[PDB]
From Swiss-Prot, chain B:
Subunit structure: Tetramer; dimer of dimers. Interacts with EML2, MAGI2 (via PDZ domains) and AP4M1. Interacts with BECN1, GOPC, GRID2IP, SHANK1 and SHANK2. Interacts with CBLN2, but not with CBLN4. Interacts with CBLN1 (via C1q domain); the interaction is CBLN1-NRX1 complex formation-dependent; CBLN1-binding is calcium-independent; CBLN1 hexamers anchor GRID2 N-terminal domain dimers to monomeric NRXN1 isoform beta; promotes synaptogenesis and mediates the D-Serine-dependent long term depression signals and AMPA receptor endocytosis.
Family as reported in the entry's similarity comment: Belongs to the glutamate-gated ion channel (TC 1.A.10.1) family. GRID2 subfamily.
Membrane spanning stretches: 18-38
Species whose genome carries this gene: Homo sapiens (Human)
Highest taxon in the source lineage: Eukaryota
Record localization: Postsynaptic cell membrane
Protein name: Glutamate receptor ionotropic, delta-2
Length: 49, 49
């Protein structure tokens, strides 16, 4: 028996037999809660150097 | 598919977008210099200075 975080894919299906899937995959994003602080040099940002 | 090649991203001003103001100063320099030159030439011919 194999059990792990193992995804059904046809290339694997040529070397193993999977059962019906028990869980649905997805691609996620992890982000830190966004900063709001104004840039220390926003006072000079209106013009390029 | 590009709807506009914005190139602006930081929102700063730049020389290409501002130089229309520099043209005003350059015109001032031109005219004031030419006034000085024409006065200094006419000082050859006024008879008084």
């Amino acid at each position: 028996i194999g059990i792990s975080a193992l995804t059904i894919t046809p290339d694997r299906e040529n070397v193993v037999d999977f059962t019906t899937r028990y869980m649905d995959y997805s691609v996620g994003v992890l982000l830190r809660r966004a900063e709001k602080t104004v840039d220390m040099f926003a006072c000079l940002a209106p013009f390029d150097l | 598919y590009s709807s506009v090649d914005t190139k602006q991203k930081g929102g700063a001003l730049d020389i290409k977008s501002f130089a229309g103001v520099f043209c005003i100063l350059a015109a001032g320099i031109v005219l004031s210099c030419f006034i000085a030159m024409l006065e200094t030439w006419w000082n050859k011919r006024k008879g008084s200075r």
